[PDB]
Design an enzyme around this catalytic site. Structure first.
Site, PDB file in Angstrom:
ATOM      1  CG  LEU A 276     -46.823  29.374  44.241  1.00 11.36           C
ATOM      2  CD1 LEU A 276     -45.979  30.631  44.149  1.00 11.36           C
ATOM      3  CD2 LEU A 276     -46.103  28.455  45.335  1.00 11.36           C
TER       4      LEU A 276
ATOM      5  CB  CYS B 296     -57.258  26.899  49.972  1.00  8.14           C
ATOM      6  SG  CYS B 296     -58.596  28.296  50.783  1.00  8.14           S
TER       7      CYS B 296
ATOM      8  CB  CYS C  14     -61.431  27.302  51.856  1.00 14.20           C
ATOM      9  SG  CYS C  14     -59.569  27.408  52.407  1.00 14.20           S
TER      10      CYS C  14
ATOM     11  CG  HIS D 122     -54.751  27.753  40.518  1.00 11.53           C
ATOM     12  ND1 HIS D 122     -55.192  27.511  41.903  1.00 11.53           N
ATOM     13  CD2 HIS D 122     -55.240  26.386  40.072  1.00 11.53           C
ATOM     14  CE1 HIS D 122     -55.808  26.720  42.282  1.00 11.53           C
ATOM     15  NE2 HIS D 122     -56.084  25.936  41.182  1.00 11.53           N
TER      16      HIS D 122
ATOM     17  CG  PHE E  67     -80.546  49.699  62.219  1.00 10.64           C
ATOM     18  CD1 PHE E  67     -80.225  48.389  63.007  1.00 10.64           C
ATOM     19  CD2 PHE E  67     -81.872  49.905  61.737  1.00 10.64           C
ATOM     20  CE1 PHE E  67     -81.384  47.704  63.479  1.00 10.64           C
ATOM     21  CE2 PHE E  67     -82.913  49.015  62.312  1.00 10.64           C
ATOM     22  CZ  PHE E  67     -82.393  47.966  63.071  1.00 10.64           C
TER      23      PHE E  67
END
Ligand SMILES: Cc1cc2nc3c(=O)[nH]c(=O)nc-3n(C[C@H](O)[C@H](O)[C@H](O)COP(=O)(O)OP(=O)(O)OC[C@H]3O[C@@H](n4cnc5c(N)ncnc54)[C@H](O)[C@@H]3O)c2cc1C
Ligand SMILES: Cc1cc2nc3c(=O)[nH]c(=O)nc-3n(C[C@H](O)[C@H](O)[C@H](O)COP(=O)(O)OP(=O)(O)OC[C@H]3O[C@@H](n4cnc5c(N)ncnc54)[C@H](O)[C@@H]3O)c2cc1C
Ligand SMILES: CC(=O)CSCCS(=O)(=O)O
Ligand SMILES: CC(=O)CSCCS(=O)(=O)O
Lengths: 522, 522
Positions: free
Chosen positions: B77, B81, B86, B136, B500
């Site tokens: 599933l 990607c 991706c 996976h 910062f």
């Protein structure tokens, strides 16, 4: 010797050059005089110190239309951060992260063999020293040409009274005074602390004239100690941290703290808790040769020729407290009310001078608020519920409550994290995003891909805390914290548009559970 | 051969291994059958496809108390990607960024000499192929054990009608169908496009059986084309990009786009605008030997043995449209109303199947919104005003309006950016933060430290757009965009707590100008 630079307009690079010249000047350098000779107004406030708090406070005050004057003993504006604090620290942390990667994949792809490779600490410090005047140049330029500020640099300020200050051989008057002299490096009262080879963040970038040996001893267990310690370790040196109490107490989420500590130990760092240095041994030439310390298991001796003190910074209140009669706190911090007002009339205190948190956001904001109050705008400032971060070989970001903290506080909660709690533990390919992809895919390196978690109130559905170890989430925590203070829920988080693959997977993971009225952890 | 996995409980790593086995099985592998045979409830929806849209839609539907069934032809599933989209894209971009760093500081500090070093593309693709089953495994495990989803994998779905689907030799009925089969690689209608050596994102990770030569030709100017192109360039190969129209149009801010393009060209990339491939030359062995294309400067021929197509993905609508009678758009996208409903009763369409934007947030969110509608909750979805990003050798993030776009929209504006626009240009030590410190301090590398800018309406003081080139801001843009949609002003931005050094310096810089009633750019 005083130089009137008021009518001079040096570029960023020109300023960078002029500052270097003044710093390495045997006589100490000429005073930088940047005052307006036509302004008849009386200074609304004279800032003692032009660092983060002083510079920002002045910028805001001027923006409001008032008149200010900065006086700093350094020939540049910006304070410690650009000269010996946050800036070099980030250069060192960048190296620590890049080096962990190179060592992990040593002899693979384009990565060279790091087996017996020891990176030069002095080479990197020298790199910083060679380019730090760059940022200093931008600050002197931006402050004068863009922020329209008045200032006198490379000359210590002389506070006479709550309305008078002597600088550049002259005497200035002001309606108010804003003390922003910051804090200095912490130290130890042990034999040998003054030996050659002992450094702190400030002296490291000014007096390192040799390349450290194979073993480094770091004293302290918070931000500075860990940040510099991981860098030394990354260069290939055995790094032993002597922590008086316990390390990284700022990381409240137990699992997050454990992951961070575990990854530091995996890199070879040795962390000894409950330890107190008793003596820094000197050799016949006055150089450090070893460190002796008492620990829970007895006395120990670590051979080394390089010791780094990463202790808390101490407010520079002494002089000012004596001259003005300021009320001080237990740690020497100047006491102030919610309006940044000290015990002395028309005298405000900001930045590291007033204590923790000693961060740039606190320094800059306190400086601005004090300025607004000086201009008649009554506004209170009490730092609370702010995001925070620190570096190890990873970027570690956190805000709000840790998991155990929330449950102990009476909050029924659920957590959403990565990786999930299973028998495979951290040895799975998530979390993963920019800068952790190699770890996610490498052989036996999956556990190094990161750790993250959000703590959610099961009833209100509001996010109570967020924690992240990896890279690229720091900037996001600034904005995420604001949303959380607004009352961010798991549903609202799930409704956002994520930019996959994202450093924080909070948006989509929340969406996976938000469909239920009775939330369940993931 | 159907494996009833319902009562089996594999770990994430056991799933990874099992999936790999099924994927490499010569006969095609066994079907993974995970259905609750004892639940008598009707299925509220059967999802054709278990990729980003189908998996998320199922998770949300199940969370709402409804029943779902996923059918996917792959044995895992998560869709494209993790297998070829991706995820590998990010592994490659991570390499591109690290390689630019290594090449910039070649022979310096701990960096090896990259002068004549060509990184193996196949080695990296092989690394991806070797570890992609990890993600996976997590998807199969998470979906079954944590999200309580029902699914049938490694079996093509055979839709019978709008309420009936065949899978694993069994027939299932459902109240609705949610089509989530995504899109397939775009191709060129030119001679030689099927020659060996021509790849797209999908075939690259399945059929690369040789190491590419010294030159790479990339067709397209899409995010994918640019992302892969920079990776190929980073490995040390001459990279020529054949863009059909204008390069990087997605980056609306002119200055930001120029910076990105200039940096790409500095790395040696050749970008050709208004070009269209006319033929892909094959040698006598059936392998690509050259690419011929028409450009604004006449026909050009580039010798190469490796061509990468980065064209638009095409919706997989043909078969489903024929069976169900779905109305389609000009590009083959399945047409849907704002509730994700197709022209066919009780049939929804989501993800890449319904067209652009083809992003994970769109796929996942559309899947969930379709699920909510199926469950009786009327909810519309129209992607608009979302943040975006892409990788070159840097991370490029953008949202809202560009500077020019804002003025054309009639807004009177001011901007706050880094570095400042001065005589010294980009050659200054700012912007700077995590992963840009070496560039900021290196000799002659300051210009590579990044670029960033926010666009503000001078009158309302609201932030109209944000743009950033560097590292570590991508995640922040997800959250910053939400604040901007809420009506964020420069004052509110300045009131935040910055961490910062921050990838985006927007907070403190806004604070430097927020004190004035009449805003001035910085
Ligand atoms: C190693 C280290 C790393 C850090 N990393 C971070 C980080 O990543 N993020 C973060 O947010 N914070 C960080 N901090 C903390 C941050 O540096 C400080 O909170 C902040 O610099 C304090 O600002 P300030 O204006 O109060 O003081 P400073 O900026 O330190 O400046 C005080 C100024 O007053 C001047 N001055 C002092 N005495 C006199 C005098 N008698 N006459 C005239 N001028 C005088 C000084 O020369 C100086 O310019 C770090 C600190 C250290 C030590
Ligand atoms: C190279 C590349 C890089 C990308 N990078 C990003 C990025 O960085 N960020 C981002 O947000 N988006 C990115 N995207 C886009 C993103 O991958 C897609 O938008 C998203 O995967 C689409 O999801 P989907 O569910 O619509 O389709 P998919 O997830 O692709 O899945 C469709 C599913 O249906 C199955 N299927 C197809 N036909 C059948 C059938 N007949 N029977 C049963 N199952 C079938 C497939 O096997 C598959 O599992 C990228 C795309 C590409 C091509
Ligand atoms: C350019 C530079 O000095 C970076 S360190 C920040 C100094 S200040 O803006 O907080 O005064
Ligand atoms: C673990 C993995 O597959 C990462 S790619 C995202 C797939 S999904 O969550 O969008 O279905």
């Amino acid at each position: 010797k005083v130089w009137n630079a008021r009518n001079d307009h040096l570029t960023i690079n020109q300023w960078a050059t002029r500052i270097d010249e003044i710093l390495e000047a045997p006589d100490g350098g000429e005073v930088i005089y940047n005052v307006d000779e036509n302004d008849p107004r009386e200074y609304d406030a004279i800032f003692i110190g032009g660092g983060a708090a002083g510079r920002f406070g002045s910028a805001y005050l001027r923006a409001m239309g008032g008149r200010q004057l900065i006086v700093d003993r350094w020939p540049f504006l910006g304070g410690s951060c650009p000269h010996n604090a946050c800036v070099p620290h980030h250069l060192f942390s960048d190296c620590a992260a890049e080096l962990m990667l190179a060592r992990t994949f040593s002899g693979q792809y384009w990565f060279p063999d790091m087996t017996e490779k020891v990176v030069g600490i002095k080479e990197v410090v020298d790199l910083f020293r060679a380019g730090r005047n760059g940022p200093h140049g931008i600050m002197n330029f931006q402050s004068k040409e863009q922020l329209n500020l008045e200032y006198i640099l490379n000359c210590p300020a002389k506070v006479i009274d709550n309305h008078t200050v002597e600088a550049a051989g002259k005497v200035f008057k002001a309606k108010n005074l804003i003390l922003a002299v910051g804090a200095g490096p912490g130290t130890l009262d042990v034999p040998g602390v003054n030996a050659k080879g002992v450094f702190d963040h400030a002296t490291l970038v000014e007096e390192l004239d040799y390349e450290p040996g194979s073993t480094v001893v770091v004293v302290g267990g918070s931000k500075t100690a860990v940040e510099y310690g991981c860098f030394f370790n990354a260069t290939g040196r055995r790094t032993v941290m002597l922590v008086r109490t316990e390390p990284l107490k700022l990381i409240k989420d137990n699992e997050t703290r454990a992951y961070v500590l575990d990854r530091m130990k995996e890199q070879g760092m040795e962390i000894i808790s409950g330890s107190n240095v008793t003596r820094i041994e000197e050799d016949a030439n006055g150089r450090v040769q070893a460190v002796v310390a008492m620990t829970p298991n007895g006395e120990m001796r670590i051979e080394t020729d390089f010791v780094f003190l990463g202790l808390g910074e101490q407010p520079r209140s002494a002089e000012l407290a004596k001259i003005l009669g300021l009320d001080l706190g237990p740690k020497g911090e100047v006491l102030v009310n919610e309006y940044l007002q000290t015990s002395v009339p028309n005298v405000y205190a900001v930045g590291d001078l007033i204590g923790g948190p000693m961060e740039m956001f606190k320094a800059r904001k306190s400086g601005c608020y004090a300025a607004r109050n000086v201009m008649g705008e009554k506004i209170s400032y009490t730092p609370k519920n702010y995001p925070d971060f620190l570096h190890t070989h990873y970027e570690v970001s956190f805000l709000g409550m840790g998991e155990e903290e929330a449950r102990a506080a009476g909050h029924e909660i659920v957590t959403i994290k990565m990786p999930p709690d299973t028998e495979n533990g951290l040895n799975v390919a998530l979390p993963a995003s920019d800068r952790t992809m190699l770890y996610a895919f490498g052989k036996g390196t999956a556990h190094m891909s990161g750790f993250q978690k959000i703590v959610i109130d099961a009833k209100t559905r509001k996010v109570l805390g967020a924690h992240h170890v990896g890279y690229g989430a720091k900037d996001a925590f600034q904005y995420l914290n604001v949303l959380i203070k607004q009352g961010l829920t798991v549903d609202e988080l799930g409704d956002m548009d994520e930019l996959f693959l994202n450093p924080t997977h909070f948006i989509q993971l929340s969406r996976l559970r938000a469909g239920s009225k009775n939330l369940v952890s993931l």
